[PDB]
Write a protein that binds this ligand. Structure first.
Ligand SMILES: Nc1ncnc2c1ncn2[C@@H]1O[C@H](COP(=O)(O)OP(=O)(O)NP(=O)(O)O)[C@@H](O)[C@H]1O
Ligand SMILES: Nc1ncnc2c1ncn2[C@@H]1O[C@H](COP(=O)(O)OP(=O)(O)NP(=O)(O)O)[C@@H](O)[C@H]1O
Ligand SMILES: Cc1cn([C@H]2C[C@H](N)[C@@H](COP(=O)(O)O)O2)c(=O)[nH]c1=O
Ligand SMILES: Cc1cn([C@H]2C[C@H](N)[C@@H](COP(=O)(O)O)O2)c(=O)[nH]c1=O
Ligand SMILES: [Mg+2]
Ligand SMILES: [Mg+2]
Ligand SMILES: [Mg+2]
Lengths: 209, 209
C-alpha cells in the first residue's frame, strides 16, 4: 500500500514549516509511517548554492537559479519514489508550485516556461494551500533578510499561486492559515488522513503531464 | 554593429574544439573581434559539478544533470549579450543542441521536455554541424573514459541531432568533418564570414521561441 505525497504551499510566513512538522508528528502518533521533506533541500551541493543565493551571499542569473531549484527537486525523486512505494507518507514543505510562483513573480518569466523543468515530477496526492492575508503574514513578527522577503514581490507570487490553482488535475485544498497553530493543524490533519486513505488507491501520478 | 553568435555542434570527436579554436584565430587575424566560448563551461560552480559527473567522479540524477547543463548556459547569457552588443563575434563549442541530444538519447526523455530549459536563450545566427561517420570518429584515436563515450549512445545522440535539424527557424549548415583539419577549417571560415556580415543585420533572436 503506497504512502501519500502531501505538499504544503503558501506565501512566506503562512505557517508551512510549523504545520509540516506538526503533521508528521501527528501522523506518526496515529500509527502512520510518515516523514518530512522540504524544498529547497539545502544539504546537497545544489541546495548549498541555493542557500547562498537566498541569503544574498551570492548572485545567480534568474533563469539559472530557477533551474537549480527544480534540479534540487529532481535529485530527491529516487528517494521520494522509494519511500512512497514502501508505504511511507511524505509531507513536503514547499514544492514545484513555490518554484513557479517565485520565478513567475519576476518580470518576463511566463508561467509556461517556469513550469517546464518540473513537468514529470512525482504528482502530489494533496496540495494544501495555507491562505493568509499578506498583512496578517507580516503581523507575524517581521520580515527576515532573505531574498524575496518584501511585500510587492510576495503579492506577485500570490497572484501566480492563484493561477496554478486553476489546474484541476491537482487536488488543491485551501486552508485558513489565519487561525491558531492548533486549529490550523487540526484542519490539515483531517484533510491529510483522508488523502492517505483514499487518494492513494491510484498509482503515483506525474506532475503537469 | 553587433557580433554574430556562431555555434559548432556534432557528436564526440567530430572536431568541434579544434575547429572552434582555429575559427577564432582566423577571424581575429582577418581583423574581426572574435572570442571563444564552450559548453559545458567548467569554471563555474555549476560547471564543476558537471565536470565531476562527466568524469564519473560523481553520479547525478538524469533530470537534475540536464537542468544543470542548461543553467550553465543561462549563467553566461549576460556576458554573451554584452559581448555581441559590443560587436564581438562569439564562437561557441557546443550549445543547447548538445544538451538536448545527449539527454534525449536516454530512455524516457522526450525531445520536447529536453528543449524547454533552453527556450529563450540567445539564438545562434549560424549553427555548424560537423558531420562525420561514427566509425570515422572512432578512427580518431580511441574513446576517452568520460560518460557517454560509447558507440550505442553516440548513435542515439546523432539521431536526436537530426531531429533538431528539422527546425528551420535555425540557420543550420552541414560541414563535412571527415576532411583534413585545414580543409574543414576553410569551409567553416567562409560560412562564418558570411554570417558575421549578413546574418547580423537583424537583432539577436531567442532560441526555440
Ligand atoms: N497559526 C499561526 N498563528 C500565529 N503565528 C504563527 C502561526 N503559524 C506559525 N506562526 C509563527 O509565524 C512564524 C512563521 O511560521 P513558519 O511555520 O516558519 O512559516 P513558513 O510559512 O514556513 N515561513 P517561510 O519559510 O518563510 O515561508 C513563526 O514564528 C511561527 O511560530
Ligand atoms: N579533420 C580531422 N581529421 C583528423 N583528425 C582530426 C580532425 N579534426 C580533429 N582531429 C583530431 O581528433 C581528435 C578530436 O578532435 P577535437 O577537436 O578535440 O574533437 P571534439 O569534437 O571537440 N571532441 P569532443 O570534445 O570529445 O566532442 C583530436 O586529436 C584532433 O587532433
Ligand atoms: C522551493 C522553492 C522556494 N523558493 C523560495 C521561497 C522562499 N522565499 C525561499 C526559501 O524558502 P523557505 O524559507 O521555505 O526555505 O525559496 C523559490 O524561489 N523556488 C523554489 O523552487
Ligand atoms: C553542452 C553539453 C554537453 N553534454 C556532453 C557532451 C560531451 N560528451 C560532454 C563533454 O563535452 P566536451 O568534451 O565538448 O567538453 O558533455 C551534455 O550532455 N549536455 C550539454 O548541455
Ligand atoms: Mg518555512
Ligand atoms: Mg571538444
Ligand atoms: Mg510546451
Amino acid at each position: 500500500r503506497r504512502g501519500a505525497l502531501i505538499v504544503l504551499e503558501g506565501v512566506d510566513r503562512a505557517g508551512k514549516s510549523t504545520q509540516s512538522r506538526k503533521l508528521v508528528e501527528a501522523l506518526c502518533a496515529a500509527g502512520h509511517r510518515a516523514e518530512l521533506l522540504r524544498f529547497p533541500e539545502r544539504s546537497t551541493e545544489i541546495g548549498k548554492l541555493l542557500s547562498s543565493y537566498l541569503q544574498k551571499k551570492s548572485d545567480v542569473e534568474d533563469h539559472s537559479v530557477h533551474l537549480l531549484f527544480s534540479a534540487n527537486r529532481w535529485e530527491q525523486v529516487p528517494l521520494i519514489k522509494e519511500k512512497l512505494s514502501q508505504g511511507v507518507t511524505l509531507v513536503v514543505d514547499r514544492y514545484a508550485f513555490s518554484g513557479v510562483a517565485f520565478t513567475g513573480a519576476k518580470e518576463n518569466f511566463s508561467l509556461d516556461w517556469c513550469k517546464q523543468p518540473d513537468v514529470g515530477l512525482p504528482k502530489p496526492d494533496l496540495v494544501l494551500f495555507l491562505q493568509l492575508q499578506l498583512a496578517d503574514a507580516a503581523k507575524r513578527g517581521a520580515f527576515g533578510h532573505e531574498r524575496y522577503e518584501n511585500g510587492a514581490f510576495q503579492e506577485r507570487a500570490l497572484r501566480c499561486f492563484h493561477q496554478l490553482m486553476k489546474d484541476t488535475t491537482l487536488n488543491w485544498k485551501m486552508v485558513d492559515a489565519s487561525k491558531s497553530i492548533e486549529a490550523v493543524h487540526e484542519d490539515i490533519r483531517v484533510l491529510s488522513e483522508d488523502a492517505i486513505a483514499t487518494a492513494t488507491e491510484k498509482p503515483l501520478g506525474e506532475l503537469w503531464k
